[PDB]
Every structure is written in C-alpha cells, then in structure tokens.
C-alpha cells in the first residue's frame, strides 16, 4: 500500500494564467472559447458544465468548437 502527494501549478509562475472568450448569439445560443485543448481528458465537457452552471442555462445551449 502506497500513498502519494502531488503539487498543483506550473512551477514557472507566469504560465498560471488563462483566458476565455464568450459570445451569446441572438437566438441565445452560446459559443465558448478558452485557451485549453481537448486531448481526451474531457476539458471541454467540464467547461460546458461550468458555463451552464455559471449562466443558469441548459448545457444544450452552450458549445465549444475548437481552440
């Protein structure tokens, strides 16, 4: 049986920064763009869940297309 601890952050301080860009179109559909990429880890899935919670709207009105 083995434990682990693992430090969270970039050890270069200036990399710990992050931008997003959001548009709401006139049918109310939402386009989210942020600096992260999807490699299978479900980042975009998580970002849609965060946006839907923050905006108080269904996930079906929110979309992430690409980085």
């Amino acid at each position: 049986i083995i434990p682990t601890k693992f430090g969270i952050s970039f050890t270069v301080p200036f990399l710990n920064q992050a931008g997003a860009l959001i548009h709401v179109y006139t049918d109310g559909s939402v386009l989210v763009s942020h600096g992260g990429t999807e490699m299978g880890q479900g980042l975009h899935t998580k970002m849609v869940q965060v946006a839907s919670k923050a905006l108080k709207i269904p996930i079906s009105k929110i979309y992430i297309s690409e980085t």
Binding site: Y25, D27, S29, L31, Y63
Partner: protein
C-alpha cells in the same frame, strides 16, 4: 416623375463556399457578404441548428455596394 432601378455590377458576383464538419451540425462558410451575421442566422435557421454551430468568414469582397 419616374426613376429607373440599378444593377450593382460589383465585379465579383455572389459566392459562397460551405464546409460541413460532420460533427454536431457544424458548418464553416466563406462568403462574399457584407452581412456575416444574417448569413450565419439564415443558415442556422434553414438547417434547424443553433447559431453557435455556424461559422462565417469574410476576407474581402470584390464590390458590395449594398447588394
């Protein structure tokens, strides 16, 4: 008094390329238009898809003049 109408005669006529991305109704369009917004909406409405799915790109027009 009467005044006759007029043809725009932009040297470049109307033109559109549409790329369907195969995922979630996404479509990317290159179009000779003064109105990328209404282009985006009209295409979304015809497809029965949210606006956030449709991307319109306009580099330049060979004339528009309102036409």
């Amino acid at each position: 008094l009467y005044i006759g109408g007029q043809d725009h005669f932009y040297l470049e006529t109307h033109c559109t390329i549409a790329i369907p991305k195969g995922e979630e109704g996404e479509m990317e369009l290159f179009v000779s238009t003064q109105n990328a917004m209404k282009t985006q909406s009209f295409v979304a409405k015809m497809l029965g898809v949210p606006v956030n799915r449709i991307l319109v790109r306009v580099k330049r027009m060979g004339g528009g003049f309102g036409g």
